[PDB]
Symmetry: D4
Subunit: 155 residues, 8 copies
């Protein structure tokens, strides 16, 4: 039932998108990967979002755009359910592209998460408030992350 | 049915917490406001989170801590459902406290949102994937934000 | 004659827009002031741009958005002719909102200018390559600025 | 009255950045010239060169290239009548803070700042396109193609 | 005798921890190296600290956490005696992870030291106020560093 | 053999910051002295003062206070045998970047950096507390009370 | 017969220039105060600098320009002897205007000093290498600064 | 008989110091190279500076210390005539070590220059106010830099 739409601004973001998709798969969550720019292909992004919004199933969008991230806010303002911003990494200007993801106007509320695997985790825990299968799979994952540390310690 | 636990590190964060609480109220979402520090009162935060986790109702935590935000990551790692980090504003070191909210390890995934009203919005849209009442109230709110702009334009 | 569309993301940008509009008026350049957000009212911005794009007169767009400026690149990718990004000033995060105006993808080329009077000056000077009336007006304005400096020096 | 872009750089060391801009102007069919002159070390040489270019009866732009503390963009911009574009070479020294020397102009100095060399060439083309129809056709072709690659990437 | 507990948030911090541990060994100071995250294994850290806190010997904790350092303030608020924060080096966001170690609330007082050899030196020097054996060892180490500089100068 | 804290500041202008640190040490029952000396302007005066304090047979710490480029913390730290604490006065010049002059020590120089004056006093108390039981009781009282205010705020 | 030429970019810099001139006057050093912009009035600056350069006497230029400082490099590359950059203070972009004064090309060597009174002191101390009178006046002023600190101390 | 004393904080600075010395040698200026740290060897620096100060001849000190630069202010506050700070380059914290060289107290006026060859040029140009031979050598070198740029241009 759940769907995550992973929407990136450029094919050059694919490496980052696929890290998120891989991790969604570990949690049993269906995803779609799509490409569309809020600067260059604005009407194509709008028509694509109308198709997804029309589907009667619980959904999240994870929005990926490097440089000045117009995409996350654009998507977030169009759709009605929650969204997650997960920009690809950059060291340009000491990582200052990050501000274009953080500094939203009033009424625009994408969830910002830096790491791709953490973005996928957040999606899974959003669904888990009402989805017992996903909830069970997040529980197993997080406990295993905690076990690794305790096991590393005892060694 | 939904519950948002608003957990701040210090009573001096209350002004910021109350902005979030006010806005949750506009969406018909029950909240609890609580105080506890991840540096100073770690066992008290743990016992408080066990009580909330024990409740069989869909829940989110919104975690508020100024300066170096240990709280959001601490809470996020303990609980199983999603959390939101919403630190109070600061201009110390050009706002560099923000990094302590962004830079999470692997497996820790709080949603970072700067504005208090946007944090509340995000909570509401998380619930709205499965809650028709809240979904209807987010729809009305966001459409009214969009109408304001179009109305400002026509003037 | 030339037209400048001053498009801002919020009514709260109006004081900044008015400074740009006032300066354009001193060069005798017609303007229009409009409001629309790239986040909250994308289709309204799309619809509005299609209207301005259909006018047969030389035009520039001056795009104003505080915080994370999605508006300038959005408009820039939509319209045919040049645009100018002139964000309102902010000292939050030591002014780091500016990077959201600077960091464009390939094929998006808004001119970034900080001061609202300088954004109006650049717009004038874009038209001046072909518009002699605006060129003379720019010339008098720039010569005037230069003369004030020289007079300030000689008065010491 | 054919368009001209003068690409003026502060040092021979900037040549590779200048060539990326020249190359892209060539795809738009816009004539350019590449010149060298320092606002710090060869001020009178720059003034003499600008006076020569300024005398030409043709629509012109200057794209100004200087690394480190960019004195050149403001210097040229304050001297010439028509619009200019600042396109500094990339640097990660001090986390890119050389950029502030291109951004922070006094009143009356209005160079258009664009980071990417291809985007500086595109802004140049789109400035002429307000009046030059052939350049406008070439810009629509270029920007349409950028957009089609994206749609095409998605559908693939 | 003195004990230093070197507590790091992840196995990936081990190379940094080992540099601190090696340096302590040159001052003849006993250490223990442990792993626990303030985010992922809070109760394990609580349980571990209660064990070390029950030892009747002078102790310091040296706390190592990359990224947003929750670990140092968490341990510092829990234990009675002093602690030292020594985060692993990072150049992400121009090193801005450092602020997560600096910006403590009221009543949380870890000593921040950047270099792992300097964190070990501070720990030694904390003990040295009361431990003559560590004091002589510190004295020889510091005099030695000073002599190398003077010898480098005289050799020129 | 009673604890002593020497609070050494670079200028009389730092006095208000020094007093906040002295006040808090007083609540812990720790004797202090407040002195003035510049590592830039009065180097020999500082060396002479440090030699006097260093000769005392009692557990001692130096808390060093210098605004702007902090030469003083490293200067004192390299001179004395036992631990030191850097606690610079607050500044928002250059977005607080004076802090890097307290953080970036060479090898062999290990002052403890703490931002808040009350926290620098607490770190001092907790350094002595490893060996001094009365100070440890006073620290538990203090930190327990901080924690109780919080629990008490929540339950109210 | 030393001369220090204080050249600023705008009359709005006059308050900063007056602090420098005042301090120069305390050392018995003659100054001239002048206004000219490297962006808006380049030829005016060149002709001004020609007049001073033609004076057969030991001279320094102190160059003041806010925002992107094109002036100090421009002056420095033109004149023969040493120059000093002392820009006015700014909090814009976390004080990032400073980079425009720091980041010079090869062959351009203005001395950067932040504080106006310290810019005047460096000027004195430059001349003092060969001017015995200024060496006496610098010596008494610096000694007087040291003595103030020692007296402030002795009162505690 | 000018003397430039190049004083560095650590032998690890030697590569940077050698670039300065090399360039001084091209202007016919005698230099000495010395090592001493303001943190670890303060008395050694003081006694060294006493020896050079006692020389009846025109001198400058060029002070090199990486990380938190305590050295330039320390040297500058001690000696009578002008000094120059030229720290080694660093990318640590986005180059924020630079602030430790910029942010001086009242009465401390080291000239800050980034590039080693420019530090040597400022040294020359300081002496050139009264030394006719160095003025000739500076003049030919600066003219030669200008001519290179004009020749690079003329080839395009
Ligand atoms: N900010 C933005 C707007 N449209 C695309 N981008 C982003 O800018 C970078 C460069 O895009 P392109 O490959 O189209 O030049 C990519 O990360 C892409 O997500
Ligand atoms: N970082 C942190 C850890 N424990 C509390 N804080 C935060 O630090 C600031 C100062 O807290 P206090 O009032 O306890 O000094 C408050 O915003 C609080 O959320
Ligand atoms: N970045 C952005 C996207 N949509 C509007 N903004 C800008 O965000 C600020 C706050 O907008 P509002 O008043 O809509 O909250 C305004 O400067 C506005 O231009
Ligand atoms: N800022 C400046 C002033 N004069 C030239 N530049 C720039 O400084 C860098 C180094 O110049 P040079 O090669 O002359 O040392 C080059 O990018 C050049 O454009
Ligand atoms: N900040 C934090 C909280 N818990 C662990 N970390 C740190 O985050 C980094 C990545 O941790 P992991 O290897 O657990 O992903 C490590 O430096 C670790 O100390
Ligand atoms: N960095 C430094 C060197 N000597 C003194 N300071 C500090 O610089 C500031 C100004 O010093 P003054 O009052 O002497 O001008 C004060 O905080 C002082 O501690
Ligand atoms: N950078 C520059 C070039 N020409 C003048 N300035 C500086 O820009 C600021 C504003 O100048 P104006 O008053 O001309 O707008 C002033 O500090 C002035 O020295
Ligand atoms: N700041 C300072 C004080 N004493 C030496 N340094 C500098 O710190 C760096 C490392 O010094 P060391 O080699 O002594 O660790 C070198 O650039 C040196 O000049």
């Amino acid at each position: 039932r759940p769907l995550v739409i992973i929407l990136m601004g450029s094919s050059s973001d694919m490496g980052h998108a696929e890290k998120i998709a891989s991790e969604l798969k570990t949690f049993g969550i269906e995803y779609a990967i799509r490409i569309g720019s809020a600067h260059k292909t604005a009407e194509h992004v709008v028509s694509m979002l109308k198709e997804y919004e029309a589907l009667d199933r619980p959904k999240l969008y994870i929005t990926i755009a490097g440089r000045s991230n117009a995409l996350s806010g654009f998507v977030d303002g169009f759709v009605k359910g929650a969204t997650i911003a997960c920009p690809p990494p950059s060291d340009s200007f000491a990582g200052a592209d990050i501000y274009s993801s953080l500094r939203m106007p009033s009424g625009i509320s994408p969830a910002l998460v830096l790491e791709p695997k953490n973005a996928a985790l957040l999606a899974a825990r959003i669904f888990s408030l009402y989805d017992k299968e996903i909830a069970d799979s997040v529980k197993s994952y997080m406990e295993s992350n905690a076990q690794k540390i305790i096991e590393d310690d005892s060694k």
